[PDB]
Amino acid sequence: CTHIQNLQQLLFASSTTAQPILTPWPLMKELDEMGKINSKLSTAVEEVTLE
Amino acid sequence: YVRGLLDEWWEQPASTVVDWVTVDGQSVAAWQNHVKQLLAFYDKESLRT
């Protein structure tokens, strides 16, 4: 009884906002912007070396 | 110190950094006149001599 309601709205917040939020709510900028420079602009890093 | 904000974009998107390696070379184009002299000024003697 407790879980099913919990699983839907509160533990949902404790799941959907847990693995990408609970530890990483300030690490989303360390998740996406990290991929912006070192994964998306990763090939663009060779640009300075290539040119 | 917002002045150097573009300098961080001069790290990974560093097309600008390698772009101006010629303008300082252009800044010494007057010094390159001697480099110009070894070939162009050798044509000066073609009609001088």
UniProtKB/Swiss-Prot annotation, chain A:
Disrupted gene: phenotype observed: Lethal when homozygous.
Secretion signal span: none
Subcellular location: Cytoplasm, Cytoskeleton, Spindle; Cytoplasm, Cytoskeleton, Phragmoplast
Function, as annotated: Involved in microtubules reorganization during spindle and phragmoplast development. Required for gamma-tubulin localization during mitosis.
Family: Belongs to the HAUS3 family.
Quaternary structure and interacting proteins, as annotated: Part of the augmin complex composed of 8 subunits. The complex acts on microtubules and interacts with gamma-tubulin in spindles and the phragmoplast. Interacts with AUG1.
Name the UniProt record assigns to this protein: AUGMIN subunit 3
Swiss-Prot record, chain B:
Protein name listed in UniProt: AUGMIN subunit 5
Annotated compartments: Cytoplasm, Cytoskeleton, Spindle; Cytoplasm, Cytoskeleton, Phragmoplast
Highest taxon in the source lineage: Eukaryota
Complex and partners: Part of the augmin complex composed of 8 subunits. The complex acts on microtubules and interacts with gamma-tubulin in spindles and the phragmoplast.
Residues of the full protein shown: 748 to 796 of 796
Purpose: Involved in microtubules reorganization during spindle and phragmoplast development.
Disulfide bridge positions per record: none
Family statement: Belongs to the HAUS5 family.
Origin species: Arabidopsis thaliana (Mouse-ear cress)
Mutant phenotype after disruption: Lethal when homozygous.
